[model samples]
Target: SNARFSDVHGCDEAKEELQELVEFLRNPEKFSNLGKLPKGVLLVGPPGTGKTLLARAVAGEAGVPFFYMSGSEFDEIVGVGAKRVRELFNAAKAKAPSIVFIDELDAIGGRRNSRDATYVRQTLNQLLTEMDGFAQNSGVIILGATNFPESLDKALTRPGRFDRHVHVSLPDVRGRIAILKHHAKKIKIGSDVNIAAIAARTSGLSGAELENIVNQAAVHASKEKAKAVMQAHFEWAKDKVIMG
Candidate 1:
């Protein structure tokens, strides 16, 4: 699916930061004075805060290619991870002006003091080497998402690597309301679905949790054979989501 920046509901600040990257990707000449742009951005936040979504939006908004794969894929076997990183970088460089997103980045970019440090450390070294091999304006920006930034290797988060860090924190009340309403568009919700009320109650809930609430409410409406999703269904769904 073409996930645009508008598809995202909250984290306005994160979006703003990513939008600048998109601009750089689209027209590097406009940012000539800035010299080389940042090579990578690490989206640090709790799970379900739309970190992945933001990455995709950057690529989509910029009309560039996006490469997203499991960071664990690099952990397959000894030396293979290192080989794949080079191949992946080559692929991205060929496409130039593209974005490569590494989800669950902690798996490969983690600190190297663990028991299985031999192959993993070598793979990480290859990652660092590949990152350095390219110029900052090579148009292959790397995006990594990890809930635990502290667990990442210091080398990966240094100046030229995944240097630009964006925090995709949970939304506040107003943002929550926007998120709820954003998800509500998919369902046939009645006028009485009090989205603001639901948002008020779900203060600390992430965007994904709010989306689930809307999903559960639709399920409730379907179960009762209602014409459209109602406030009562949402109330019940909220309880179900909170309890279970």
Candidate 2:
């Protein structure tokens, strides 16, 4: 997706958190001080927010190999979560200076409630134990993306293991404008299209949702054989998006 940090809109805090990461990726040796940098970061946000997008942006900035898998992937089979976890980490280590992205980490990284199965416990234990084995300069940074940070185990979020956590919220008006412009880059639109108005109207909407609105507006324009997507088209898109 050619997704770089510059491509992402809003979440200044998230961007700042990843700043050091970008530096580390560009030159790991530069950050090899007394203990080196942390090896994990947790991106917390609601569904439809740009959690995965942020990971892609990091990968783009890193220009290093990235291994991605959902938390559910580990639990796809009956009791293979632990084994898959080991394999995933091994694969990331094999490609040193790589990244392992675990999406919806709460699926297996949740707090140890009594309702959890033995396999769940095993997987959770495996995660913390394996992550603990890595040195601060292991070179294989871990990225955990989840909508439910409270669901994660305490030890997993401790220092040196998923040490950093960043919040990614829906873009504000200015950010929405940036995001709208990004998504609308390739789409032709009318001069009358008021992007600021659209951003104002789209409060609480995530980046993905905003992109959909722009795409739908373009579709509306094409379907009507209109000269270009206009203010009316985006309004109609907003209606169908939020209401329907």
Candidate 3:
């Protein structure tokens, strides 16, 4: 899927911060004076804030290969997660100028303190080692996202590893309107729909939630056999989204 930066509606600050990394990936030669490109960037935000999409956008915008894996899928056996991590990095390095995006990072990276402590430690240790051992200018960037950043292991959050952090906060009213309009384009939105009013009504909602409203509104319109999605449909959709 071609998830470019423009495909994402909000989180302008995050987009701006990630564009610099895209630049480095596209032209590592321009930064000859710098010893190495940053090792990793960790995206911290609430759920449905488009952290994963942002990572994909970076790859798409940079025209680099992307490898995506969820942290929860890491370990099924004792050493499986560690082995998988090694292979993931190996594959990314071979394709140098690639991205390895690990979503739900806390699943494998939470601070170690449990009966399965040793098992958990091995998986995280492998992750730490890979970040440390990778070639300086290998052109492979690791992007991780976790809603629970505080739960991540201390070592993994340190300066030399996943040092850079991008916070993808919820959108503001202007952002909500942009996001609503972006998704609304997919459907037949009636002229009667006031996007600004919709945005104002959807205070404190994530981009994903706003997108869902657009989807639900379309569904409501279809249920009624309407010609287009109207403002009344949005009101019903908003209620459905909020109540259900």
Could you say which candidate leads in TM-score?
3
**Number of clashes in every candidate structure?**
0, 0, 0
lDDT tens digits, residues 1-244, model 3? 6789998877888999999889988977776456546878999999888898899999999999999878878445245678888899999989989999999888885644575677777788999999898765778889999998888878888888888899998899999999999999899989899999999998888888899999999998999999999999999998887776
Each prediction's Cα lDDT score?
0.85, 0.82, 0.87
- Residues 1-244, model 1: lDDT tens digits: 6679987887888998888889988977676566557787899999889998899999999999988867767555444677777788888899988898988888885544566667688778988998888763678889999998888888888898898899999999999998998989899989797998998888778888889999999998999999999999999988887776
Task: Estimate, for each residue in 1-244, the C-alpha lDDT of model 2 and write its tens digit.
Answer: 4578887887777887887787786667767753447688999998777988888788788887788878876444365678878898999888778778899888875544465667688887888877888865667778999888888877788887887888988788998999898888979879999999999999988898899999999999999999989999999998888885
* Residue 141's lDDT in candidate 2: 78
TM-score of each: 0.91, 0.91, 0.93
Q: Model 3 reaches what TM-score against the true structure?
A: 0.93
Q: lDDT order of candidates, best first?
A: 3, 1, 2
Candidate 3 lDDT trough over 10 residues, lowest sum: 72-81
